[PDB]
């Protein structure tokens, strides 16, 4: 019965570390989406500015 006390509790606790891990991964997805969209934006900004000045 001791294992059953642990099993229900560890499983309940495990879901807790899993839902926390999933929330940390969605925060890292938001930060990578931030970096990839500003990556494309700053790519275009720098490329057009430099190529503009050079061919001017």
């Amino acid at each position: 019965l001791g294992d059953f006390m642990d099993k229900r509790d560890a499983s309940i606790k495990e879901q807790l570390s899993g839902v926390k891990d999933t929330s940390s991964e969605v925060k890292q997805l938001e930060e990578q989406a931030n970096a990839v969209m500003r990556a494309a934006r700053a790519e275009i900004s720098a490329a057009l500015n430099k190529m503009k000045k050079e061919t001017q």
């Binding site: 019965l1 001791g2 059953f4 006390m5 099993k7 229900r8 499983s11």
Partner: protein, 223 residues
């Protein structure tokens, strides 16, 4: 009425009633607990809640009294509760004045001193086992720490801890059964049943105060 016994001979004399009464407690403890551990479930079904809530109660009176290392001593205190809880509830509830042994009564395993001083020694070994395992074998809790002149106070405290814990459990069960024995001789059973409910109340409590105080000497030895 009767405070005597019949003895059984195996080279020495031992009480017939105590062994026999105790066996039913053993068969009703293993026979009912092991019917629920046959096929357990994740969410506890009907009947497993009561055996889980007992086990969660034993963890309460072990962790509060011992400490962080309660978990090895759970099956000991779990026996010293349940072997004394069911032994008292068998005395009041199981009708044993219908069965007639030719020499003695059958009420409880704890009506003789032979059970209660054995259970007071099984909990006495336990705090000498915990006292000599965790701390040093050379010097342990009887060492005269606050003052050197406290020696006869602390030597005699060794004797009083199993003895006062035995006659507490021995007397109140022998008293409770005798009130049932005496009042039946005066009156039929419709009058003594509030007195039996006052007795069955303290019959389970003196088991609880045993296992609470039995764990309380464990935590004293570990310090």
């Amino acid at each position: 009425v009767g405070q005597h016994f019949y003895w059984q001979i195996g080279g020495f004399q031992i009480h017939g009633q105590v062994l026999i009464t105790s066996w039913v407690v053993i068969a009703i403890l293993l026979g009912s607990a092991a019917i629920a551990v046959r096929s357990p479930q994740t969410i506890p079904t009907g009947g497993q809640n009561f055996f889980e809530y007992v086990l969660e109660f034993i963890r309460d009176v072990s962790k509060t009294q011992i400490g962080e290392e309660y978990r090895p001593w759970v099956p000991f205190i779990g026996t010293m509760f349940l072997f004394i809880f069911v032994s008292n509830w068998s005395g009041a509830l199981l009708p044993w004045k219908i069965i007639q042994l030719p020499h003695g009564e059958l009420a409880a395993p704890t009506n003789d001193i032979n059970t209660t001083v054995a259970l007071a020694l099984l909990t006495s070994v336990a705090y000498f086992y915990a006292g000599l395992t965790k701390k040093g074998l050379g010097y342990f809790g009887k060492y005269i720490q606050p003052t050197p002149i406290l020696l006869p106070i602390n030597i005699l405290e060794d004797f009083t801890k199993p003895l006062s814990l035995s006659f507490r459990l021995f007397g109140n069960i022998l008293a409770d059964e005798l009130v049932v024995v005496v009042l039946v001789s005066l009156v039929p059973l419709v009058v003594p049943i509030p007195v039996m409910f006052l007795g069955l109340f303290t019959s389970g409590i003196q088991a609880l105060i045993f296992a609470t105080l039995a764990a309380a000497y464990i935590g004293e030895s570990l310090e």
